[PDB]
Curated annotation (Swiss-Prot):
Keywords: ATP-binding, Cell membrane, Glycoprotein, Kinase, Membrane, Nucleotide-binding, Phosphoprotein, Receptor, Repeat, Sensory transduction, Transferase, Transmembrane, Transmembrane helix, Tyrosine-protein kinase, Vision. It is unclear whether the potential membrane spanning region near the N-terminus is present as a transmembrane domain in the native protein or serves as a cleaved signal sequence. LDL-receptor class B repeats lie at residues 769-812. Residues 207-300, 583-683, 961-1048 form the Fibronectin type-III domain. Receptor for an extracellular signal required to instruct a cell to differentiate into an R7 photoreceptor. The ligand for sev is the boss (bride of sevenless) protein on the surface of the neighboring R8 cell. It comes from Drosophila melanogaster. Coiled coil: none annotated. It is found in: Cell membrane. GO terms for cellular component: plasma membrane; receptor complex. GO terms for biological process: cell surface receptor protein tyrosine kinase signaling pathway; germ-line stem-cell niche homeostasis; R7 cell fate commitment; regulation of TOR signaling; sevenless signaling pathway; visual perception. Belongs to the protein kinase superfamily. Tyr protein kinase family. Insulin receptor subfamily. This is Protein sevenless. May form a complex with drk and Sos. Binds the phosphotyrosine interaction domain (PID) of Dab.
Amino acid sequence: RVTRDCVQRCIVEEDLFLDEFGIQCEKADNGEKCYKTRCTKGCAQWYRALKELESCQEACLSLQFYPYDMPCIGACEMAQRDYWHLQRLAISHLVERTQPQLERAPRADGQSTPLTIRWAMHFPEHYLASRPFNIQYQFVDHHSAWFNLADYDCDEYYVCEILEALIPYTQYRFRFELPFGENRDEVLYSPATPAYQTPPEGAPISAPVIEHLMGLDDSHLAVHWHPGRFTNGPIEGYRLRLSSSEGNATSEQLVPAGRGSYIFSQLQAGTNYTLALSMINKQGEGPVAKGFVQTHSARNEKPAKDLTESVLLVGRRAVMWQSLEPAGENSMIYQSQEELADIAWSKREQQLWLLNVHGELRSLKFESGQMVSPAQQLKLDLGNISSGRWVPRRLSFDWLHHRLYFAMESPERNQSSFQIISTDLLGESAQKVGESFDLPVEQLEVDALNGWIFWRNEESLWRQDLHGRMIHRLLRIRQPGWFLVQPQHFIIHLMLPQEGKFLEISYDGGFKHPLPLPPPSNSHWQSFALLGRSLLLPDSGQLILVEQQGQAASPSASWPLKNLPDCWAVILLVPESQPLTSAGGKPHSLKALLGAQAAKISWKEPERNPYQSADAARSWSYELEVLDVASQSAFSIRNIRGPIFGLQRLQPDNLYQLRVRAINVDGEPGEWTEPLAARTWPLGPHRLRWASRQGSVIHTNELGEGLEVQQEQLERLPGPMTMVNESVGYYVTGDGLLHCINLVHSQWGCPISEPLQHVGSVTYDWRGGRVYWTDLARNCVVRMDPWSGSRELLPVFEANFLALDPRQGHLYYATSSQLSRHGSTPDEAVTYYRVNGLEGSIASFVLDTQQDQLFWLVKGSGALRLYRAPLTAGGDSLQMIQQIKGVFQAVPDSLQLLRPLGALLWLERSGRRARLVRLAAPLDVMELPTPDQASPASALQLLDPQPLPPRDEGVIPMTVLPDSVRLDDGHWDDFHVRWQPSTSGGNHSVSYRLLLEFGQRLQTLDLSTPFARLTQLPQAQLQLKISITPRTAWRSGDTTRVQLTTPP
């Protein structure tokens, strides 16, 4: 069925190959020494060879047509390729819809049988038993690297016991890798084996992943963690060890398995701490994860009772003002004849927001030096809310998002719900907040910085965000008292007068240890104020300032309140309690992209902690300094916003190691980030070509700006395209197909007007004027001349990625497993590096000819390793330059040298980013985002600003003169076929390929000398048909055909 294909391809391609030996078949020619006969022999012996599966090269040995039947090898190999494709279609059409399964598990009957596969038997001969294959296992991760087993014993049974070290307690998915063909995306798979979990029994190997280590409060460090990627046995707890940096105070806490946070208590303030997260299971402990954090620096008690900050004392009808300094003023502010509900507080403006039981909003701007102020009503709007009667009960002020939060009362009979609104300062922009509820509101306080609104009803302490999206419970007991959340400590101080507990519940509803409430020094309290660690307790008719140390309930200071014996609420009048912004979290993940004279610096916003909501205030001013390592010219650029910035006008002779700081809205110096490397002047202008998968080619600058699209369109999934000259270029597409295109004059005919299938990569040599492409069908390489269009074959086998060094003619080929250089002599063929069948395959390689260096890519199990090697020293300085972290695969052949920049450029599989590795600083991989007009990209080249040099005629050895072909004086059985040495204009070493035809026998010789010593000739005076093709290490000359007779 495929022999017809062989014959048709042979007759089509009979004259397409102009062999170097000077053999030429015309149509209807029955010459047996020529291409068609060898190809027919190849596809007649191809099946016989496949009986025992011998190599085509050794199957094509000819007893009369030495040394190599290259058309026979080609015919055999394409026969194998077509046969394998046909078998692929057959195996896909018959079944291929059956997965390897595990129905019976390792028993407890004393048989320790590991993974077993009992999978149906639909297989033909040959491919069943003698055919080897590989099995790879899939890692089950929901948010890894796929490896292949190295040990499995099985046969026609297909029950493969695996001694591979599978790590216990990790879910696996198995599958069969069936190798059909040589292309990466030309392989079929077995769909999926049902997920199987290997039994447990080992210590944990992964330390717990710590995701948040906030410095909550001054002495209440908190830590967030979860299971590590690996478990190794069921987990029953964790080991938390905290060690001080200046002391021996080490606290070790143990936590059951199910928990996602932990909080320590009673720590020293203003000192750096470290935390030891340990993952522990039944059989033992595991690794240790370390974290560095310093707790918030507290506010010391300061002048004992002399601080100038005041407090607002509130009674039934009073807004009394009092300051804590000794003999402080007790100036009364304002009186009302109705019952007062609560107050608010503004720091940016000395203005109060009073509200009685009837919802009368009275502005009470604290006049500078005068208590008397207008008490005008601030009648609110209700058209946008509802037409019913609405009387607010509790209110509070937001000092960052200038607003006024209220607790509303609906007029519903027997199911009167309560609601929150967010009006404007004058109270006109009514806004729906959250959902309705039936329990009455007793106190509303809003935390502006971290973005939360806290209220307490008779039962719980519901917490909400500024808008009303997330509502989360905090605590539910009987009749909670007063709480005084402060924005710079992340903890709430909840008082209970009946139980006398005075809790310290944290923001997430966890850490909840009560404190010793100070007993009265003579009753009940309804509020308090927090002056640092000291507690300000407003007793009735007496204000005590107690240093809260437990049993230290002694009044450090007292201020009579004989004008108000029924105080119920106190608020500390300190500017720190309403700060404009909070801790200056340093920017993280600094990234620098550099070009010729411009740079694109991108760095991420400081990460938020879970205690602050989405609507939390995060307004950030930025600044960035740039200094030279050598010149030390430092300059900082302020008034910058956004996570992305573009540097402009870098000065020459400079390195730009860079580091970025974040400036708070107040204007206080932030925390410096880590330094980052840079890059110096390459030369100047460059031109990168981006090949989009849709076929659009886009030219950009070094960074990707200055886009200049091209008017012409390429085919689907193109590869790097090689310029024959300034006009015509070759390229290879994703499915193994090449097209010849013309950039400027499309009407001009290409050297070959039909695209060629099954091609891997193409390269052009400027000195030889010939273009080479890797032919997977023939498993060899061919010669193409853009002018003549003739084909000549080069005996290089399994050639996948090609590159030619034009200086000395050595041809460098990269097979899938081994790398070597093919020269004019067998002794010169030196393998630079060889991989085995398990570590991976060569992905791409580029040749550096000015530096006499060779580079290549080695695809691995889960990472790609860069290498180097000298061409003059065989395998002497192999280096592991960069092992990429993560499963990032580079497109084959996409690796192209960057002579301006002196680096290597390859494109990842995604096609959205490119990676740069520089010779001077290999340890830094530079990202390059693909332009969106070209994303995703399939090929990236750097066009040399220098024009491609013209073809050099100085080579191309002159045709051997027919009159110069003579047989010099020797015996008829030992004589030299001597011709005048073909002279190349560059004095290059000329080699001669000799075709000798005598009778029905053909003798061929590859000679580095202008003479051929012929021995063992059967008879004297024989008529010898001599064909001489003078060849240099780069090009082949015209063939000379001469007939001679042996002289004495």
